[PDB]
Amino acid sequence: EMENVQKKLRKLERDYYQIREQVVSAKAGWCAVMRMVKDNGVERRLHRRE
Amino acid sequence: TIEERVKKIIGEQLGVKQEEVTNNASFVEDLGADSLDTVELVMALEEEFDTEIPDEEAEKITTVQAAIDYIN
Amino acid sequence: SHKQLATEQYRHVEMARELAEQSGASSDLETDHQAASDHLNLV
Amino acid sequence: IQSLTARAPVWLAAQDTLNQLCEQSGETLASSNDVTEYMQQLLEREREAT
């Protein structure tokens, strides 16, 4: 049983790997948008924090 | 050299350029990266080097230099 | 779960080791008791 | 946490309107009494300009 749980760990590890690529690739674009938005839009107009 | 990875990735994760980061400064407050941003930075570092960093060790990267200290 | 599985593996190996020793002891005891049954029949 | 979460959005909307309002003026408000005294100064300027 515990060996099969180890193989579960491997499957979960590759799932984690997928999620991790998602996160880093997303930030790469967040960078650009928040660079351009600094033309006073983000101050309060686009950032409707409600 | 290999550090070009870190000093590149850091910028790509924080919006600053390669030379902007100073070894004396701290990510948490002197770079503008909040808790979420620093988590993203450390986790991107984890992804790049195909390795793992537990929570305890990961929390010891608040300073700029540490990003290479644990690497090399 | 990764660290828990490592620890569980270590403990599991320990129990397997002590059971191996008891298996050997059981074979030795079977030898002795075979002799004992022979002795009963001889008496 | 549930109480704070239910309360949050109202407070945030109120804060956005307040920031817009006080920034639209020259003076920065900090309390109910402060807003009232600013009302009075506004009335005085009305009755001089008129």
TrEMBL record, chain A:
Residues 1-22 form a coiled coil. The hinge domain, which separates the large intramolecular coiled coil regions, allows the homodimerization, forming a V-shaped homodimer. It is found in: Cytoplasm, Nucleoid. Belongs to the SMC family. MukB subfamily. It comes from Photorhabdus thracensis. Homodimerization via its hinge domain. Binds to DNA via its C-terminal region. Interacts, and probably forms a ternary complex, with MukE and MukF via its C-terminal region. The complex formation is stimulated by calcium or magnesium. Interacts with tubulin-related protein FtsZ. This is Chromosome partition protein MukB. The chain holds residues 1088 to 1137 of 1482 of the full protein. Plays a central role in chromosome condensation, segregation and cell cycle progression. Functions as a homodimer, which is essential for chromosome partition. Involved in negative DNA supercoiling in vivo, and by this means organize and compact chromosomes. May achieve or facilitate chromosome segregation by condensation DNA from both sides of a centrally located replisome during cell division. It comes from the Bacteria. Signal peptide: none annotated.
